[PDB]
């Protein structure tokens, strides 16, 4: 499982979304290098204009690429589930606004690590920060707090993302996450720890489609 990540691995992401009945699709390509916790990705809205802010999709759009320090390798659930993969589900509660519910399957297709996602968003405000596009195209950085879930043979996680709003304020997105293996083989059930994650968002100056370029670092921590 871990051996599948010792080099650079191609990534494919495919997302189908429906937020308040606004339907859209995103496709992504890039590479991950778990040795350095490093991800480089480019996403394109294939249906036209994205109806929500790109920053709100970052966490949805492959924590198997986390750098787990040598001394914490027995706590890496994500790679232990490979190549068969895992289901990753979230509910993301946007404070004073709607929620996303996401279901994804993360697995290998040949040599390529694939993340296939369905996203459903409901109860958003038409002129809120999300459907009104009031969030700054700004990096996000925070800690993903992971705990074991023995009853599902997987993990749970929780974290908060504070998205900057255009007026200087913050739009909180409270994340609740569950991962469960797809295969029936043994997986690593971790002690409590976190992934320290930083995502830098940018634009391809030659790209005319609605898109997002990401450079992301992911590092496991919190166990000495």
Numbering used by the authors: 4 to 64, 68 to 230
Could you give the paper's own sentences about this structure?
Fluorescent proteins of the green fluorescent protein family are β-barrel-shaped proteins that contain a fluorescent chromophore formed by the autocatalytic cyclization of three consecutive amino-acid residues and, as such, they provide convenient genetically encoded fluorescent reporters of localization or interaction in cellulo. The sensitivity of fluorescent proteins to specific X-ray-induced radiation damage at cryogenic temperature has been well documented, showing that the conserved glutamate residue close to the chromophore (Glu222 according to the GFP sequence) appears to be specifically affected at relatively low absorbed doses [i.e. ∼0.1, 0.8 and 0.1 MGy for IrisFP, EGFP and mNeonGreen, respectively]. Given the sensitivity of this residue in fluorescent proteins to specific radiation damage, the cyan fluorescent protein Cerulean, which produces well diffracting crystals, was chosen as the first target in the work described here. Cerulean possesses a radiosensitive glutamate residue next to the chromophore, the side chain of which is severely affected by specific radiation damage (decarboxylation) during cryo-MX experiments. To evaluate the characteristic dose at which specific radiation damage occurs at 100 K in crystals of Cerulean, we analysed the evolution of the atomic B factors of the progressively radiolysed carboxylate group of Glu222.
